[PDB]
């Protein structure tokens, strides 16, 4: 398999003002001696370094892209949003929204981040590669058209899909969002649309806080083309396998996508500070294998994975590597040193049974229960 | 209330070799640009800084202590363990066990950490203070007599309890361990003993990995004097409140402690990388309030809180502050900026009902009668 | 000796936006993975920690102070400067001047920094202590009345001296500034004054860049009451001993101070990134011993040392400890592990002779040559 | 011009135990909250990132290489040194010598660092490239055959030169070492040899501490084929230009090198914590321009630059970029934001005159005639 890896070093130069994890410095929050904001360059940089040291980089088709044009950005965001962002970026940064801090030059880097997503979809639709991975930072799946949130400043995936519709005329795109938080940006933009099926697996009530959303299935022309799977906090490998087999694959089977796009955050990993789930690198490998199979059956193999969250410096690189190995069909020498440990921590039989029953009920609510 | 705060700046200078969270650097684990080992000084240091800027430190009895003597340490650890640790500490550090890396000078700093625990028990038993908090790093609750594990190198609480029995002759001590991980060191040392009741609240299967332990209730003379409460991963405030009121308080009521020691890790907080629970600073405030009340009813107020885990630099300081406010009866100006957010993330009604039923069954399995707090005559 | 140590934990919570050493992030300057701005909390924090671990803290009179009032600040800075600073502080920070970046809450912390200086002078003038040390961050000696510079936001020492003149009526204050950079704020404010002798030892041309200033000796009523000693870059222990014996002590002898204030930066140390001098901890011990002796001979022992620069995390704590040991007359167990190494690096005989001749000429220019 | 850039990401993963700048943690040296050892990955990594965002990397021949073989390493180091290093590397690291701390896996990464130097010489001798830059970390110029020192564990350049003599039979190699510290490893190995001219520009007495070395000009067969230029501390751009034109170029002209290797440390930059010199990125650009010209006149353009020291995270990337622009003949968009500021800090006329006179006397002491650049026939 021919996998394109879209990456630009400048995406690792985006940096907010001083934060302790997600907490802006000031008042009772002391400036950190070392760390900084949870969305730090180093998580993404360490994925890139492990790809290089593993030699996977040599087996990929390495590519960059021009930044997103105004035309592409304006298909989803208003001009005054672009101005406000630009102005705040030139004045050293600050807070652009709710949990949406930016640094100096963040505007140009966010444009580049959106450009990589655009180019990755384009490459896979033009037949330049069988599938693709876009290491775009800052992420996109929380961003609303006129509102930055959750560390996201442009709706990278939506911007990329609208650019793909204009240039190629792809009619049916599925967005599977396994970032551990709710993909509310993507949900909102495509809520009354049937040309995009948006599916979000997420920790129930995590982010946005208190939101589950099982009953929000889309509206009018979009009714039945948005699916939320609020997994109980503490869930791990089995919960996600169960969700994939009962909800996600049946839903994709029904929808018949011509292109699958994955909002791939790795913040469901077992050591992430920003969620409470218990995935290991083989979970992400297994999920990628399942969605790639769906892409091969319906979409001519056309699958793009766009990097979103993941806030464990130590463990995100192994999770990301697992996805890219699975995308490319190349198994590197890297062994995940936390995998066997995380297997031992999984939910017991009773908790697994409890979550499994909830997913059976949910699959029944969505009218996805087999039979076939 | 008169609260002693046992602290020494040197405890913040203990530092392992390069690690990425818990992963030793080498092989496929790249060295971190900034951070380092998850048991970093900065979590504890930021607690101490917040105590200082909040004004709480001025209202406490700030105290240090001499390091633990050989005699005190030898009551639990063998001489050859002390020698091996000493030797590795003098040769720049290395791995002393399973998830037990040490740095240069770690031996002397671990002795100091144990000394603060010893002194904090001593101060509360001598009536020098009503209660105490010991900011002892490195922690202790995983350490076995001849095996360092879980970032722990001496069994701080066991060393402190044995020193307290020698000096004061206290007959019944309860150890409540609400660090999110299983307090296996304390469990093992006191497993056939009825003079120490060890209770561990912990995430089922977290650390040590795969261990739940509900059926391990102690053996022979110690049968019924060890209780494990394996809470389901993802649990938060209600799960813990429920465990406290159905298991912990009934168990303490039956045991009639003359001293309560809390192994207080803050790694059950909702943003900790090393567990999956969802506590906020008011959870820890509420737990401290309940155990302080038990100490006042049975133990003449005698309560000591010994710092164990907690690996979120940003949030541990607010959790630690909550406990110390509750210990001292002083409310500072500090407002927890994550409290309201974490409240919105809690388990839904169905998951809370599920965990609650498991605790009811567990309380029944331990033969615990749901009696309610009353004073001992 | 009874030494007061003025310190507040909140001074360590001041933090600028992202910088690589002195370079604001943006353009070609990548955000640092770890470090940050060169004026970081950790240099000062590590001095405080070493004081605690050495047990020196137990031998000092530990004290804090209220923040500087508007009245005290307004004796040197205009109200609109206070407003502008405040407003920028409330809007998350930014650039307040030339090499003068601030963070959120920096206004309140700078007020506290000025308050510690005020209180330290007050304590020594009121006879509460024999001498004092103020660990005030952010520093002050570069700040002009209407212009923040060199990481300084209020003229801490000038604010403290004017507060001391109002409350006690001290008539003659000497300011010895051995921070490695030029104390241009103090120079400017007292340039036409004979009630304050300002002496600056500094690396020739370092900061402000290109400035030597030997010929700037004060003007009108202040003529002869400002002395600049531009030491050649690369100079170390002997250069400074030579300057102290030929210029500084004679100058103090002539002036007859009732109070000596030292702007004590430790950035002349041999491993500082922001200068090129080669001092070790015994140099600072020796300089403190000399100025304390002058204070005992003229000023009834009244000496205050106010912390200014110093940007080596590793080495500043040993230099600071040396001064405080000398102030208090208490020798701790701490051994400087770099002292013997730095001794071996000192300028050779020929370079020492060259610098010594330049200081003889300079002492002659100032009309300080012995004789007696 | 065709410039090979020898680089491997694994060279950035070498990491010693906890240090505060050069000071091992322990005793009175508190562990750093953030930074670590002064020889940190980030200085080199930020050079590589700036090369990438400037667009320079796209215009270079980016290349890696296999690690140095045992055969290559054994040409300079003894087997027991390799074994001791290997063993300490496998046991989590420690101190291999005087200012020579290693981490876990440091043995394999040091082999790779030496391999890049070997390959970079090989590529330029085989005509695969006109010149080359090897970003080899950890560095080499302090390492003696049986003694690691100054953060160096193998004698990268010596290992590379001996491998080049075996494979190609090159007869005359010049090593110009403008790392700010004395290149004592290279000096010692080639001290009685006339096939290698070693020149070190260095701050008088810096590292090794107290060493100047002007009278150490080599011995017997090597007499006149080692030159030390101890520049006064505080010197900047003019001092170095003056040394290049009065000592270095005359010396190279006399020697007639068939290959020039530069031990390129950037720690003479004006903000380095580990020295006291005042270079800016144009200084390094000017030095590279002069040595490239010498290589074109004598050595058919054959020049290799091997990265050694440089400990300013903020400023080293701009200095490194300047050299690579000069090596390749490509000027990027990058503007050095510290250049104009550093120009204003330079030594005054009197101090420049003083240093210049010392270099005139030194050139006379070496018996160096001030001939000017001409082509070899
Ligand atoms: K999601
Ligand atoms: K939809
Ligand atoms: K526990
Ligand atoms: K027991
Ligand atoms: K000065
Ligand atoms: K004056
Ligand atoms: K050199
Ligand atoms: K030679
Ligand atoms: Zn997320
Ligand atoms: Zn724990
Ligand atoms: Zn300074
Ligand atoms: Zn060097």
Interface test with A, best of B24, B54, B215, B276 (most A CBs within 10 A): B276
Beta-sheet pairing, D101-102 with D94-95: antiparallel
Q: What is the separation of C-alpha D180 from the centre of its chain, rounded to a whole number of angstroms? A: 9
Q: Are D158 and D185 in contact (CB under 8 A)?
A: yes
Instruction: Annotate B173-194 with b (16+ C-beta within 10 A) or e (fewer).
Output: bbbbbbbbbbbbbbbbbbbebb
Q: DSSP assignment, residue D180?
A: S
Nearest CA in chain B to D92: B94
Q: Determine what percent of chain A falls in helix, strand and coil, rounding each to the nearest 5.
A: 40, 15, 40
Judged by a CB distance cut-off of 8 A, whether residue B270 touches chain A is yes
Residue A128 contacts C, CB cutoff 8 Å: no
* Beta strands C131-134; C303-307: pairing state: parallel
Contact yes or no for B207/B213 (Cβ under 8 A)? no
List, by residue number, the catalytic residues of A. 142
Does residue C91 belong to the interface with chain A, where contact is any CB pair within 8 Å? yes
Pairing outcome for strands A94-95 and A101-102: antiparallel
Q: What single DSSP character describes residue D29? A: B
**How many secondary structure helices (H) and strands (E) does chain A include?**
12, 12
Cα-to-centroid distance, A262 and ligand 2 (Å): 14
Inter-residue contact D368 to D250 (CB < 8 Å): yes
Structure tokens at D16: 């010693």
d(CA D86, CA D82): 6
Q: Cα angle at C342 between C337 and C347, to 5 degrees?
A: 170
Ligand nearest to the CA of D269: 12
Place of tokens 């080499």: D140
**Going by C-beta distance under 8 Å and a sequence separation of 6 or more, which residues neighbour residue A91?**
C94
Please give the distance, rounded to the nearest whole angstrom, from the Cα atom of residue C368 to the centre of ligand 6: 17
- Residue C77 assigned to a binding site: no
The answer to whether the annotation marks B307 as part of a ligand binding site is no
The token duo for B73 is 């340490």
Residues near B7 by Cβ (< 8 Å), separated by ≥ 6? B48, B62, B63, B64, B116, B134, B135
The pair of structure tokens assigned to B269 is 């907080």
Instruction: Give contacts of C338 with chain D, Cβ < 8 Å.
Output: 23
Bridge partners of B37, per DSSP, are B21
The 3-state secondary structure of C76-113, one letter per residue: CCCHHHHHHHHHHHHCCCEECCECCEECCCHHHHHHHH
DSSP-assigned letters across all residues of D68-133:
PPHHHHHTTS-HHHHHHHHHHHHTT-EE-EET-EE-TTHHHHHHHHHHHHHHHHHHHHTTS-SEEE
- Tokens encoding D82: 């390799």
Q: Is B180 helix (H, G, I), strand (E, B) or coil?
A: coil
What DSSP character marks residue C225?
S
Contact between chains at D31 and B15 (C-beta distance less than 8 A): yes
Closest CA to A347 of A274, A291, A276, A267: A276
DSSP state of C68: P
Q: Cα B59 vs. chain centroid, distance in angstroms?
A: 23
Sequence-ordered list of residues with C-beta below 8 angstroms from that of D106, at least 6 positions apart, any chain:
D14, D15, D16, D85, D89, D93, D138, D153
Cβ of residue A94 closer than 8 Å to a chain C Cβ:
yes
Task: Tell me if D77 is assigned to a ligand binding site.
Answer: no
Q: Which of D33, D46, D346 sits opposite C30 (nearest CB)?
A: D46
A323: helix, strand or coil:
helix
What resolution in angstroms, rounded to 1 decimal?
Answer: 2.3
Q: How far is A20 from A33, CA to CA, in rounded Å?
A: 10
- State the Cα–Cα distance between residues A326 and A295, nearest whole angstrom: 13
Task: Give CA–CA dist D172/D194, Å, rounded.
Answer: 8
- Map B254-281 to HEC letters: HHCCCEEEEEECCCCECCCCCCCCEECH
Residue pair D81/A41 in contact by the 8 Å Cβ criterion: no
Active site residue D77: no
What is the distance in angstroms between the CA of the first residue and the CA of the last residue of chain D?
A: 23
- Helix (H/G/I), strand (E/B), else coil: A263: strand
Structure tokens at A84: 């406000």
Those chains having 3 or more beta-carbon pairs within 8 angstroms of chain D are: A, B, C
Which residues are CB-contacts of B62 (< 8 A; sequence separation ≥ 6)? Answer: B5, B7
Please provide the size of chain C in residues: 372
**Is the Cβ of D333 closer than 8 Å to some Cβ of chain A?**
no
From 3.40.50.1820, 3.40.190.10, 1.50.10.20, 3.40.800.20, which CATH number describes the C1-372 domain? 3.40.800.20
Question: Token digits for B1?
Answer: 């209330």
**Token representation of residue C15:** 């933090």
C-alpha B189 chain-centroid distance: 16
Closest CA to A38 of A267, A254, A228: A267
Query: Three-state DSSP class for C173?
Result: strand
List Cα–Cα distances, B53 to C86, C102, C114, in angstroms: 21, 20, 17
Per DSSP (E only), the strands in chain B are: 3-6, 19-20, 23-24, 61-63, 94-95, 97-98, 101-102, 131-134, 148-149, 173-177, 196-203, 226-231, 259-264, 303-307
Instruction: Please say whether the beta carbons of D302 and D131 come within 8 A.
Output: yes
Domain boundaries, chain A: 1-372
**What residues in B contact A277, CB-CB < 8 Å?**
276
Chain gaps in chain D, named by the residue before each (C–N > 2.5 Å):
none
Q: Measured between alpha carbons, how far is D328 from D285 in angstroms, rounded to an integer?
A: 11
Contact (Cβ atoms closer than 8 angstroms) between residue B259 and residue B164:
yes
Length of chain B: 377
Q: How many residues does chain D have?
A: 377
To test the contact with chain C by mutation, choose from B49, B50, B58 the residue with the greatest count of C C-beta atoms within 10 A, namely: B49
Place of tokens 């208090």: C328
| Residues in chain A within 8 Å Cβ distance of D13 | 49, 53
Say if CB C34 and CB C67 are below 8 A apart. no
CA dist list (Å): A247 to A263, A292, A360:
17, 16, 9
| Contact criterion met (CB below 8 Å) for D249 and D176 | no
Distance from CA of B358 to the nearest CA of A (A): 10
A13 part of contact set with chain D, CB < 8 Å: yes
C23 touches A: beta carbon within 8 Å: no
CA separation for the pair B156, B161 (Å, rounded): 9
- Quote the tokens at residue A81: 């949003």
Tokens found for residue D59 = 């215009």
d(C-alpha D145, C-alpha D188), whole Å: 9
Q: How far is D59 from chain A (nearest CA, A)?
A: 15
Q: For the purposes of burial, counting CB atoms within 10 Å of the CB of B169, is it exposed (0-12), middle (13-18) or buried (19 or more)?
A: exposed
CATH 3.30.70.3040 assigned to domain D1-377? The reply is no
Tell me the sheet residues that pair with D132. Answer: D4, D304
Ligand 7 center to D178 CA (angstroms): 4
User: Which residue among B14, B37, B141, B142 is the active-site one?
Assistant: B142
Which residues in B363-377 are b (16+ Cβ under 10 Å) and which e? beebebeeeeeeeee
What is the secondary structure of C308-336 as a DSSP string?
-----TTTHHHHHHHHHHHHHT---S---
Q: Which chains reach chain B with 3 or more Cβ–Cβ distances below 8 angstroms?
A: A, C, D
Who's near C14: CB < 8 A, 6+ residues apart? A31, C41, C102, C103, C105, C106, C109, C110, C113, C137, C138
Ligand nearest to the Cα of B213, by number = 3
The ligand minimizing its distance to the Cα of A198 is 2
Among residues C205, C275, C199, C288, the alpha carbon closest in space to that of C241 is found at: C288
Assigned token pair, B49: 């800084």
Number of alpha carbons in the 13 Å side-chain half-sphere of residue C65: 28
């Amino acid at each position: 398999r021919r996998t394109a890896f879209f990456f630009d070093e400048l995406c690792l130069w985006h940096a907010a003002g001083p934060h302790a994890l997600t907490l802006p410095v000031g008042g009772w929050v002391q400036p950190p001696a070392a760390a900084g904001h949870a969305e730090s360059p180093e998580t993404k940089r360490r994925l890139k370094s492990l790809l290089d040291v593993s030699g996977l980089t040599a087996r990929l088709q390495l590519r960059s892209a021009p930044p997103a044009s105004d035309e592409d950005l304006l298909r989803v965001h208003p001009a005054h949003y672009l101005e406000r962002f630009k102005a705040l970026s030139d004045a050293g940064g600050g807070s652009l929204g709710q949990d949406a801090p930016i640094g100096p030059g963040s505007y140009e880097i966010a444009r580049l981040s959106a450009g990589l997503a655009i180019a990755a979809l384009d490459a896979v639709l033009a037949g330049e590669a069988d599938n693709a991975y876009s290491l775009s930072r800052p992420p996109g799946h929380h961003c609303l058209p006129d509102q930055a949130m959750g560390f996201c400043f442009f709706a990278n995936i939506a911007v990329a899909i609208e650019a793909a519709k204009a240039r190629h005329g792809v009619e049916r795109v599925a967005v599977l969002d396994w970032d551990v938080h709710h993909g509310n940006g993507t949900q909102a933009i495509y809520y009354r649309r049937d040309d995009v099926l948006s599916i979000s697996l997420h920790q129930d009530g995590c982010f946005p806080p208190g939101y589950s959303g099982a009953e929000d299935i889309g509206e009018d022309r979009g009714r039945g083309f948005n699916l939320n799977v609020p997994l109980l906090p503490g869930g791990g490998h089995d919960a996600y396998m169960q969700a994939m087999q009962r909800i996600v694959l049946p839903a994709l089977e029904r929808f018949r996508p011509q292109l699958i796009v994955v909002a791939s955050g790795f913040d469901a990993n077992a050591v992430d500070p920003l969620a409470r789930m218990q995935l290991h690198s083989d979970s992400f490998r297994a999920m990628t294998a399942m969605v790639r199979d769906a892409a091969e059956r319906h979409a001519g193999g056309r699958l793009v994975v766009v990097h979103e969250g993941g806030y464990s410096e130590a463990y995100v690189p192994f999770c990301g590597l697992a996805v890219i190995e699975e995308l490319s069909g190349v198994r590197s020498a890297v062994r995940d040193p936390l995998r066997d440990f995380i297997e031992l921590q999984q939910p017991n039989a009773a908790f697994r049974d409890f979550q499994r029953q909830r997913l059976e009920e949910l699959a029944a609510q969505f009218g996805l229960c087999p039979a076939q």
